[PDB]
Design a protein around this ligand. Sequence first.
Ligand SMILES: CC(C)OCc1[nH]nnc1CCS(=O)(=O)c1ccccc1
Ligand SMILES: [O-]
Ligand SMILES: [Zn+2]
Ligand SMILES: [Zn+2]
Length: 230
Amino acid sequence: EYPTVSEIPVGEVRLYQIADGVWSHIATQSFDGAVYPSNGLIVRDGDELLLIDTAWGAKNTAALLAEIEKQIGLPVTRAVSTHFHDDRVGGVDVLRAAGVATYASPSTRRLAEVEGNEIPTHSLEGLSSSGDAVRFGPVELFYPGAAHSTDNLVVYVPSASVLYGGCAIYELSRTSAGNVADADLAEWPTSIERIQQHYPEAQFVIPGHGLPGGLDLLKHTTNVVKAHTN
Ligand SMILES: CC(C)OCc1[nH]nnc1CCS(=O)(=O)c1ccccc1
Ligand SMILES: [O-]
Ligand SMILES: [Zn+2]
Ligand SMILES: [Zn+2]
């Protein structure tokens, strides 16, 4: 009963319980003539909530905050954007206006600025080299190397064995990349292998768009990427 793209009108946000204190958020948005679902994460951080990624736009992100207040009722105090594109930073200004401290790597912040996208306020240190990991409250942030973008991060919730791949990990049903602007197709498989190496215990893998799966999504994504490359 994970919600699917046809079930969520653009502007609405669903929450899905993955594990105790771990949710995904699911929203929908138009891009390149079609509407796509998009996932982010919500993780309990003591009495606060940590948000991973916006809901792909200001309107959706406002709906996300409203749904969180309705269903969970704890304040979102920090947010991390996992790369610079609009499905991850679009809505940052809404978050800030609501009192959320927004974060991204220096690279993500710079790239968002260059792109004309919203810019998270605070820089995350310790993530500039492939294989780098840092703790951020109840999650670990990991830079696997260039893949979907040069700056992309993935997020692991060690208490729940949940790995959120962002746009670097594809859902199982997805057999094409679509738009590959800003991707590093040549490095992407290598970056995936780094994720596998670091999180071999992951029980739930959440792609950037679409249905949750397991670690099988890693090899699947590599296959799709290579098949584009070929
Ligand atoms: C925000 C935008 C610049 O990036 C969207 C994106 N995120 N990950 N890949 C893509 C581009 C391929 S897509 O065909 O538009 C696609 C989108 C989502 C789900 C499946 C397929
Ligand atoms: O994206
Ligand atoms: Zn992207
Ligand atoms: Zn995406």
